[PDB]
Design a protein around this ligand. Structure first.
Ligand SMILES: O=C(O)/C=C/C(=O)O
Ligand SMILES: O=C(O)/C=C/C(=O)O
Ligand SMILES: O=C(O)/C=C/C(=O)O
Ligand SMILES: [K+]
Ligand SMILES: [K+]
Ligand SMILES: [K+]
Ligand SMILES: [K+]
Lengths: 417, 422, 416, 419
């Protein structure tokens, strides 16, 4: 993480001050659970009141112990009497407290992700309803295709992020677990009853089968979800970058307070942001390949990409929302492009004569191509030349919008559950 | 996909014939929906005589340069000008492809689910057979504390059952169909015609579609398959560890010649082969992610890649699940070699003795550590003697014999199994 | 590989017939070297003439033996006597023959790539010299920046693919090796002299340290070169896709047929495929001790397609470049319709010449047919500066921006 | 990047002050070249004397302008009079200074990586010297195969890192460029003469064809090699972790014994691999530029060199301090025997007219193996030949026969005679 995109509350969760404090919150959970066995009643509350998080001293102790778990508990043990810290960190293994506290840093980070994601979904839906009645020329392969609702470009990103919102909220109810199983998950000292009571205090369910560590596929699943959101971010930014260029010139980003040129510098940044979150996916997958009950190759990688994952995501979910809000939509440039193009009308009259006349395609194709009001005279040819009586619709600007946007109301409500 | 790893039922789903066979059903599903607006029985009449001719489509495509128009030309040339008049009417080409691709994916997901359920059955079988086998747990590859050998398979079991439910969650709704026109404006078609045509196929309507269905659904499935690649790789590495000559706890059951000069040398060729398969599956998740960023209402940039990895990814997914199941069943467990390693090591007893004294006595940590150091005699009764004689305290120390170790380190093996089995 | 994207010459190399063929060539290369000592002379040449290559026979034997190399050598042995096939596959390990023959498939495939790569470099420079004098609007962040030579675009990809071309030419000389090192590379029966003889027969250098296998980071480096080519292709295809769109409409893919950049969109997905294999080869680098067979199944998948997609993609991009239709007037009418970029040109003109500061020269330019005469009228009257401002009409715009286009082309092409 | 693995000299290369200092070095390179034109002579040396880099001042200006280079110019411009700073940042576009200074940072980051990688090959070679004499068991699929030299494990990793060192020094020669071509590379205000002159002041060659930015295939060419280097780092790490396990117990890292070093470096290799895809995607820039690479390059470029320098020196120390337990090595060779049956099989077929399947039943039937075998074939088979007796020293003389040749071909200078 660098200072330019840093969000202080996100990096605070992954700062060593919160890393050690979450470890301590897990230590007091298993200590309070063991109070029903060999630990005196009230010992956990005694430590919870006077415990001080001292990261510099831990690093000082870590130089001697060469292990962050031995320096942490020592920094807590030297603040109390030997009778007090007797059963502190008792029965659990090193990664029992590390990963259980690791899942705490992940739970609290998800709240910032889910909140700003839903705030982004609302900003997209808001921008869709403003531009729902603006008609634009859809582009297939970059070519003009048929007129559509310009709000559907925003409604398309809305329903995508909305599917991502269900992915995160499903994980929040399930994927997060903790472990108090002991050394290699064999419960040499503790019991599953102790793990149950301790996990009940923390508020996260119990790992069904846990080795020395927590199985890394659970974190991998969450990071793979952020990869899906990144492709949604990138697709939305590419949409904005396309309509921002001079050849299109239908949207541009706000210029804050203040040589004055319009440039899509915001959504280009959000493209690089998505490139970072996409790269974390394989990292999460490789961290799943551990030897027997554990190897610690996942730790250093998690120290890097886990703080950047939530940090980049929250900064991206917030920057994307504000960029949509400050986005300037130029309606006259959007709808004039629909007026100047008429090539899509060749297929409209084609499907109209095929549907309402008993003529084949080639017969219906030769009549339209052989053909002010393109509707007025083509209707006369059916009655005069073909002796067929029917009323075509007038394909002026009001007939175009009424034809192609006649279903946009149904698309919006089927999007909103 | 190559013939060496080709799976019959899966390769047929993605071949040219069944590709067009599903596109035909999509053409007739929307055609029957248009019969309310198209004469009655037109889709049923085309359904009864339709022929899928992949060689003919290839010849039409050499001129038209459009696979869908070539498929339409091959189908319309089988009927009258009037009978095939409303064929491919109102829909866009991608309305046919993506709606049919879902039926292909669904037919592939049905086999993967069944093959993934089968692997969970085998893992839970070996977990029960090797449940009461005591083995040395290893952290950083180092001897740690003894544990159950069946805990390894149960650990892999619940992992595949996590991905199994995710697949079933995707099976309930992860795929859609669409009939939205050129750029999703529903100019010629209607939502009523689109919705009703979907129930003929049996899939939900895409909520917001452009020319194509959003690619994040395919990417979501590939994501569930990306995680499975990790699950397959870990179980493969685990058995590769046990199979080595230095450990020699298990070996893959094999007329088969393992080596040239040593018939039959036992090598973990199955779990190693599956590791290469996992590397191929993982690499596809970067393609499916990049395919989501399509320009405006569509670009065809995802078609070339999807023609490559989608048939291979499903073909490998089915091949890998089946071979791992055959390996898990035929893997033979050397019971004595596993348990003879646990007796040869005494290091884990010192940890249990010191946490026994701290829990049962008022002594502190480093006071207990020096006691167990100075302590063939019974380690339990000799230290219980010094507790009574030298330190003057009475405590009942369970004796750490070979079966006393299994009573200590396999204590919660019942509850771990109970909460794991569904 | 699939039938739609199958290339004839490339798929021929990776077929089981040639796969078994190059195995035989490698086997006969070491056995010919073993004739100098313990093997009767002339045995390798006798097997070379009578040995059939029967994939249906190998698969018939492999169904039992579960060992591809045993089934291969057995199929070759049964076509000779016990006295002609005595020392066939003697002393070598199974991967001595596989990895040596695998490099042969890589060598011959690589020649087709370099051929079709430099051929794509020819199409790019041909289009570059054609459109050198054309002037177009440059775009930064998609927004109109300044006028530029349209030929600089194709030259930008020319030198990029030229960079990838030298990387393969460097690799083709120093990239591949063979081996005959025994079971785990300890040289029990085999000697370095016999191995060097067989290697000199095949024509490839010897691996420095050989385990049971050849270090797979050699393959991974080749793929890395091809991974960069995937981005060079995608960047070039993305450029054509942008110019093709209706809002730009500067070029279109040549063949009422409908105009879409369908070929460059095809190459975008191809490029993602070539880029997907780079991390595959990297994970194959991490073997266990002397070897683990994990890399074979993955290479049986991605290597035949990596070479296939590469040649297939380079050829289609070559055909698309030559047949691409450039619309010169629309390209140059867009420069006539843009105006605001001249503010930066007149600004630096008054700064570098008139002793006025940046804020002073800015004021007057936008306060101010042909702008050069108007600005020079202001400098001569109120400012009272006598200076000659060059005409900024269409022809004068080409002279200003394309003034150094000769130096760019000459420095980017060796003999030019 | 985090302080836990931070290399101060590397994180300072990519810190804010060195970033601007290299940009200011590039700004004065073009300004000095323009002294042969409209810019007054000696103006570059004028600004270079009293130039003060103020990161927090630049951040203050960018908080309003939302443009990093305008903020970087204002901080340098306002320190002098208008006439002196009149020609500062003149004719160049932003990315002329952004990317050309980025090449200066990368070059400085490359100077450290080359040294560490070179020193790792020396230590790996040194460790191969200490362990060359030790006979070990070669493992195929983790299974016992044939005996080999233990030092060949360090020699195999040595020649791989040396191939990566040859890749890095090749890129060191031609790989980094500077650009002064202007807005879209059109040389509107400047000339190729101005660009060529300022390039010698910076010591780097001129980019052949540059758009608004420098094409990202050069940086991608460097990050790709770092992924190749990381592949060597994980293969060597997994090797040590294999020989470290309790069942093998053939090595242990120097100072309860855990391979925490090579496991941590294995995690270092995973982060470096992910950088490749970002470097490959940073090349796909729209037209003459888009800035989407910038935010990514602000992250993985300092993280790549920081992790790489750390991993090359930690693996060197791990190799420096790795303890080799020779007693456990060679007695594992004495314990098991299987390759011997393959040896006598290849020996009988070589020197006797019998066939492979004939000699296999003879070797399997069988105290001294060589003596007993030499008597069976002269009794019932009537074969007179010299069968070498293969004991521990006899096995070493056979399976380590060509070990000196593998070493001489692996090291360029070894084997040459001097004086
Ligand atoms: O008719 C179609 O569905 C395809 C149109 C297109 O190729 O743009
Ligand atoms: O050549 C052998 O001994 C067999 C080798 C292998 O199975 O790789
Ligand atoms: O004047 C410059 O160098 C920068 C211009 C820009 O911000 O694009
Ligand atoms: K645990
Ligand atoms: K559609
Ligand atoms: K070998
Ligand atoms: K430039």
């Amino acid at each position: 993480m660098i200072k330019r995109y840093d969000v202080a509350e996100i990096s605070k969760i992954w700062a060593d001050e919160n890393k050690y404090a979450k470890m301590l919150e897990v230590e007091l959970a298993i200590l309070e659970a063991l109070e029903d066995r060999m630990v005196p009643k009230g010992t956990a509350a005694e430590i919870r009141a006077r415990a001080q998080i001292r990261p510099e001293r831990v690093d000082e102790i870590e130089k001697v112990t060469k292990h962050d778990i031995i320096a942490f508990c020592t920094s807590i043990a030297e603040q109390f009497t030997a009778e007090t810290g007797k059963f502190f960190h008792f029965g659990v293994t090193s990664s029992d407290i590390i990963d259980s506290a690791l899942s705490l840093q992940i739970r609290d980070s998800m709240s910032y992700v889910i909140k700003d994601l839903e705030a982004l979904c609302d900003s997209l839906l808001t921008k869709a309803e403003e531009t729902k009645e603006i008609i634009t020329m859809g582009r297939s392969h970059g070519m003009f295709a048929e007129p559509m609702s310009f709000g559907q470009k925003f409604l398309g990103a809305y329903v995508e992020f909305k599917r991502r919102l269900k992915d995160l909220k499903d994980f929040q109810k399930d994927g997060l677990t903790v472990q108090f199983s002991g050394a290699v998950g064999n419960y040499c000292i503790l019991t599953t009853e102790d793990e149950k009571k301790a996990a009940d205090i923390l508020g996260l369910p119990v790992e069904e089968v846990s080795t020395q560590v927590i199985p890394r596929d659970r974190i991998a699943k969450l990071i793979s979800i952020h990869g899906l959101i990144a492709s949604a971010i990138e697709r939305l930014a590419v949409e904005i970058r396309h309509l921002h260029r001079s050849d299109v010139f239908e949207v541009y980003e706000g210029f804050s307070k203040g040589p004055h040129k319009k440039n899509p510098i915001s959504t280009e940044n959000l493209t690089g942001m998505a490139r970072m979150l996409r790269s974390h996916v394989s990292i999460a997958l490789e961290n799943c390949v551990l030897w027997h009950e554990r190897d610690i190759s996942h730790s250093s990688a998690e120290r890097f990409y886990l703080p950047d994952n939530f940090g980049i995501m929250v900064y991206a979910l917030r920057r994307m929302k504000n960029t949509i809000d400050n986005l300037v939509v130029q309606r006259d440039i959007i709808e004039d492009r629909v007026r100047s193009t008429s090539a899509y009308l060749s297929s409209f009259y084609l499907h109209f004569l095929v549907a309402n006349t008993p003529f084949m395609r080639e017969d219906c194709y030769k009549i339209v191509q052989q053909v002010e009001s393109f509707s007025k005279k083509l209707q006369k040819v059916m009655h005069d030349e073909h002796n067929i009586i029917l009323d075509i619709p007038e394909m002026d600007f009001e007939g175009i919008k009424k034809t192609y946007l006649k279903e946009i109301d149904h698309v919006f409500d089927r999007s909103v559950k």
